[PDB]
Amino acid sequence: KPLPDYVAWKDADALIVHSDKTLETKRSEFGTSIITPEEKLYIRNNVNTPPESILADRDGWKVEISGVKEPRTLTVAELKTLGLVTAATVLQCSGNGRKYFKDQLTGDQKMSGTPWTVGAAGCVIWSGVPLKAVVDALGGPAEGARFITGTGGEELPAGLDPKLLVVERSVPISNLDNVILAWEMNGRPLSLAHGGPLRMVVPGYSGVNNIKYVKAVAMTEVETDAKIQKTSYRVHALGEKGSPDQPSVWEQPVKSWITTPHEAAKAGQVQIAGVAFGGMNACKSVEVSVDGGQTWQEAEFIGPDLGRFAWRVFALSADLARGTYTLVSRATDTEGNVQPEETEMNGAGYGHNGWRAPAVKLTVA
Amino acid sequence: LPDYVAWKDADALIVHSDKTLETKRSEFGTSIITPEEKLYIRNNVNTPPESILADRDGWKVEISGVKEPRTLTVAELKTLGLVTAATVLQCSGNGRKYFKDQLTGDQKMSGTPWTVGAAGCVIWSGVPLKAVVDALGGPAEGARFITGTGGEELPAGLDPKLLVVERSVPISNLDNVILAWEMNGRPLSLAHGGPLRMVVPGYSGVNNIKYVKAVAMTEVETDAKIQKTSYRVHALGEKGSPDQPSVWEQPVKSWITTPHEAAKAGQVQIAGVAFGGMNACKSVEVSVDGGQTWQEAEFIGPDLGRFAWRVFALSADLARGTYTLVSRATDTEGNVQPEETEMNGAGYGHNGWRAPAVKLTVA
Ligand code: MSS
Ligand code: MSS
């Protein structure tokens, strides 16, 4: 399957093209430098990408800020005057790990959606303006405000109900201090593929909440009742419809997976590495096992600490005999949350973080 | 753009020569890490052919000056350890333009007139030299230097010492030195020293040997031209000689990176990059009036370590006019940038705060 027009610049050999809206990073392509190369970063769109014309005048891009004491519309040019913040986060789809839930289906049980393994995730550095600074410039939040609600800038088709298609998401207002209106990713102007010219980055939260080409940010008393917030991206049992009484895919859980080696290794000393994060919290420690979870050893963190929303690279130096190993990692966050062996089933297949499913088969020769 | 860097971003680079590409001041970004396609280039000799990347894991490195000396492949090196570190990769020439501006009368200085773009901050990943040396029994008794040899093919007939890119640094750097196969998450490019590079954190660019084919623990510095007489700190009109200081440790330095030319009157975000070389940057001051008044700046983004640089920013409310933006950094040991750097003949190691001032026209 060929790389779509809007991501022709990406690295075809590093990606699994599930659909034109769905590209997964290969497990062997994450690297050990923490930061995921831009041309290898995964893609997940719910609707078609806007035209490249929206990047012609980046500084002219408009964002309606409401739910504040002094509401008005500000340009990216203006936003650039109000502040500057840089932060590393784990950008991951709630769908990441869905394949593993599908593997657990018995009988006539069925689950739709992209069968992501581990490649629907990356760690990237964002740069932009803190939402707090933007809200404080406009007098602060309106009294009684409970949510940050961001609206994707895609053109909606005329005639149809906009709420059925709009990419609009709501997160609690306690995230205000963390939220970034970002125009830059990994040192470059933000690409169209990843939400340029401006993206609402919500650290620690799942991909869906990080709104590409954000054209509106509202401090609201209620969640948006858009389809994508009200019934979609909800955690429910098999056979249940989604509904707003259920937990939405917000905070990311503690998670990890092994990234290297991916298939083969020579007998003797082998460096086993991977990535680990705690979502809202930093990863405190990681254990690695070469025998599918029977025996565990403490791993070392590799590289610098990019913050509690980022991931760490970890490594275990293992001396291995000839054979077929089953490499798995189990991470713990700073609050004591640890990955389970398996994740409790849910109907849409969101938020997998089990350690057994994503095991790497290492043939040691 | 030359063949070996055709993948780079032409609009982000100033092409001085086929061996010399400078990053534009407006292209550093505020994410700390310098985009690979925008990273500067400085070669002393022609780049090897792209064929050396065909078999990366098969690339050979002669390790000597150890108890049990032998040649190891990149494949083997990958088994011995793993390390990741962010460093400031900067040419000793960076800032040479500013030294040339200080020349009076019939004084002359050769070399690329770099301003501030002969530098980047990048994440390396590879194997610690210490682990490689420990696997081979440790350093030979009496070893004083880490000497690395560039893998370029030398022309036959000519004295190899006149052209070889071979550099020596003190052995106290052993714990920091990385034999790196990866940069910013990707396999290391040919342009930046792939398939394997000797990264010496805190030291100037010249010491970070591309396509390293030999690493020796030696009792003496290599007497190669590039080490013995070149890259030495001397006065105007003096020849270089090995009694003089070599361009080793980087001094505390900074420069403003944004905005680069224009801004609207009112609130303006003034940002830049700062590092202490061997030491972390502790603090940065920014001035909008060419050094008459100073204000403390904030650090922006995460701390990538003592060898890296920090992004800093000052939020300034500015009236209409023409400002002169300058930054002055201090390291964790109290070393601070001077206004100007003492002159030296080859124009190495500029770190003054006045010369690299940005002219901001506020409308
Ligand atoms: N505007 C917008 N935004 C947005 C969207 C769309 O569609 N639109 N998607 C989501 C999702 S869903 Mo699941 O949870 S993941 C995800 C993400 C992805 O990212 P990238 O593509 O950059 O990777 O994004 C996010 N944001
Ligand atoms: N092998 C080799 N390496 C090498 C060389 C040569 O020539 N060769 N150069 C130096 C120098 S000098 Mo003055 O100090 S700066 C510098 C650097 C740069 O890097 P990039 O190009 O990658 O950026 O490199 C380094 N390394």
PDB file of C-alpha atoms and ligand atoms in Angstrom, chain B residues 4 8 19 21 39-46 48 89-94 96 114 118-120 124 148-152 163-167 183 188-193 197-198 204-212 226 231 247 348, ligand 2:
ATOM      1  CA  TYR B   4      26.429  13.679   0.081  1.00  0.00           C
ATOM      2  CA  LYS B   8      19.342  18.270   3.785  1.00  0.00           C
ATOM      3  CA  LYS B  19      32.749  20.870   2.867  1.00  0.00           C
ATOM      4  CA  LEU B  21      27.403  24.289   5.500  1.00  0.00           C
ATOM      5  CA  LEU B  39      22.441  20.391  11.158  1.00  0.00           C
ATOM      6  CA  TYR B  40      25.681  22.092  10.088  1.00  0.00           C
ATOM      7  CA  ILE B  41      28.498  20.386   8.195  1.00  0.00           C
ATOM      8  CA  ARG B  42      32.257  20.795   8.527  1.00  0.00           C
ATOM      9  CA  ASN B  43      34.600  18.351   6.810  1.00  0.00           C
ATOM     10  CA  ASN B  44      38.398  18.731   6.556  1.00  0.00           C
ATOM     11  CA  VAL B  45      38.636  16.199   3.697  1.00  0.00           C
ATOM     12  CA  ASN B  46      36.272  14.621   1.156  1.00  0.00           C
ATOM     13  CA  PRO B  48      33.888   8.634   1.923  1.00  0.00           C
ATOM     14  CA  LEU B  89      28.206  19.576  18.453  1.00  0.00           C
ATOM     15  CA  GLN B  90      30.001  22.831  17.600  1.00  0.00           C
ATOM     16  CA  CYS B  91      32.956  23.753  15.411  1.00  0.00           C
ATOM     17  CA  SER B  92      35.894  25.542  17.013  1.00  0.00           C
ATOM     18  CA  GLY B  93      35.456  27.933  14.076  1.00  0.00           C
ATOM     19  CA  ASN B  94      31.943  28.868  15.184  1.00  0.00           C
ATOM     20  CA  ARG B  96      35.095  33.234  13.490  1.00  0.00           C
ATOM     21  CA  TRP B 114      31.016  31.256  10.761  1.00  0.00           C
ATOM     22  CA  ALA B 118      28.296  26.053  13.089  1.00  0.00           C
ATOM     23  CA  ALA B 119      26.606  24.328  16.034  1.00  0.00           C
ATOM     24  CA  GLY B 120      23.776  21.992  16.939  1.00  0.00           C
ATOM     25  CA  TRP B 124      23.601  10.339  20.182  1.00  0.00           C
ATOM     26  CA  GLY B 148      40.556   8.296  17.216  1.00  0.00           C
ATOM     27  CA  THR B 149      41.203   7.865  13.468  1.00  0.00           C
ATOM     28  CA  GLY B 150      38.783   9.003  10.742  1.00  0.00           C
ATOM     29  CA  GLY B 151      37.930   6.312   8.186  1.00  0.00           C
ATOM     30  CA  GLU B 152      38.541   8.344   5.015  1.00  0.00           C
ATOM     31  CA  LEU B 163      45.817  14.755   5.702  1.00  0.00           C
ATOM     32  CA  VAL B 164      44.525  12.127   8.180  1.00  0.00           C
ATOM     33  CA  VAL B 165      41.705  13.245  10.468  1.00  0.00           C
ATOM     34  CA  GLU B 166      43.140  11.786  13.677  1.00  0.00           C
ATOM     35  CA  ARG B 167      42.561  13.484  17.024  1.00  0.00           C
ATOM     36  CA  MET B 183      21.632  10.232  15.906  1.00  0.00           C
ATOM     37  CA  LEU B 188      23.743   7.836  11.722  1.00  0.00           C
ATOM     38  CA  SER B 189      23.938   9.523   8.318  1.00  0.00           C
ATOM     39  CA  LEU B 190      27.023   9.498   6.111  1.00  0.00           C
ATOM     40  CA  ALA B 191      27.149  13.300   6.313  1.00  0.00           C
ATOM     41  CA  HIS B 192      27.462  13.213  10.133  1.00  0.00           C
ATOM     42  CA  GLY B 193      29.896  10.302  10.468  1.00  0.00           C
ATOM     43  CA  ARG B 197      31.299   8.144  15.252  1.00  0.00           C
ATOM     44  CA  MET B 198      33.536   8.830  18.257  1.00  0.00           C
ATOM     45  CA  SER B 204      34.828  20.887  20.142  1.00  0.00           C
ATOM     46  CA  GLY B 205      33.656  19.470  16.804  1.00  0.00           C
ATOM     47  CA  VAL B 206      37.077  18.524  15.421  1.00  0.00           C
ATOM     48  CA  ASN B 207      37.490  15.938  18.219  1.00  0.00           C
ATOM     49  CA  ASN B 208      34.259  14.134  17.331  1.00  0.00           C
ATOM     50  CA  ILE B 209      35.711  11.772  14.698  1.00  0.00           C
ATOM     51  CA  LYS B 210      33.395  10.736  11.845  1.00  0.00           C
ATOM     52  CA  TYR B 211      33.499   7.154  10.486  1.00  0.00           C
ATOM     53  CA  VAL B 212      35.923   6.172  13.260  1.00  0.00           C
ATOM     54  CA  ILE B 226      45.550  18.104  12.379  1.00  0.00           C
ATOM     55  CA  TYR B 231      43.562  23.493  15.848  1.00  0.00           C
ATOM     56  CA  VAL B 247      40.792  23.160  20.887  1.00  0.00           C
ATOM     57  CA  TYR B 348      38.801  29.433  17.377  1.00  0.00           C
TER      58      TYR B 348
HETATM   59  N1  MSS C   2      36.714  11.755  10.036  1.00  0.00           N
HETATM   60  C1  MSS C   2      36.472  13.079  10.207  1.00  0.00           C
HETATM   61  N2  MSS C   2      35.757  13.463  11.289  1.00  0.00           N
HETATM   62  C2  MSS C   2      35.488  14.763  11.511  1.00  0.00           C
HETATM   63  C3  MSS C   2      35.964  15.787  10.562  1.00  0.00           C
HETATM   64  C4  MSS C   2      36.737  15.298   9.399  1.00  0.00           C
HETATM   65  O1  MSS C   2      37.230  16.145   8.459  1.00  0.00           O
HETATM   66  N3  MSS C   2      36.945  13.968   9.294  1.00  0.00           N
HETATM   67  N4  MSS C   2      35.682  17.084  10.823  1.00  0.00           N
HETATM   68  C5  MSS C   2      35.590  17.426  12.242  1.00  0.00           C
HETATM   69  C6  MSS C   2      35.204  18.853  12.502  1.00  0.00           C
HETATM   70  S1  MSS C   2      36.424  19.971  12.373  1.00  0.00           S
HETATM   71 MO1  MSS C   2      35.644  22.091  13.273  1.00  0.00          MO
HETATM   72  O2  MSS C   2      36.176  22.106  14.908  1.00  0.00           O
HETATM   73  S2  MSS C   2      33.612  20.814  13.192  1.00  0.00           S
HETATM   74  C7  MSS C   2      33.956  19.216  12.848  1.00  0.00           C
HETATM   75  C8  MSS C   2      32.849  18.191  12.962  1.00  0.00           C
HETATM   76  C9  MSS C   2      31.575  18.621  12.236  1.00  0.00           C
HETATM   77  O3  MSS C   2      30.563  17.625  12.382  1.00  0.00           O
HETATM   78  P1  MSS C   2      29.237  17.667  11.469  1.00  0.00           P
HETATM   79  O4  MSS C   2      29.790  17.924  10.089  1.00  0.00           O
HETATM   80  O5  MSS C   2      28.591  16.304  11.610  1.00  0.00           O
HETATM   81  O6  MSS C   2      28.408  18.785  12.058  1.00  0.00           O
HETATM   82  O7  MSS C   2      33.259  16.938  12.419  1.00  0.00           O
HETATM   83  C10 MSS C   2      34.534  16.539  12.902  1.00  0.00           C
HETATM   84  N5  MSS C   2      34.784  15.139  12.593  1.00  0.00           N
END
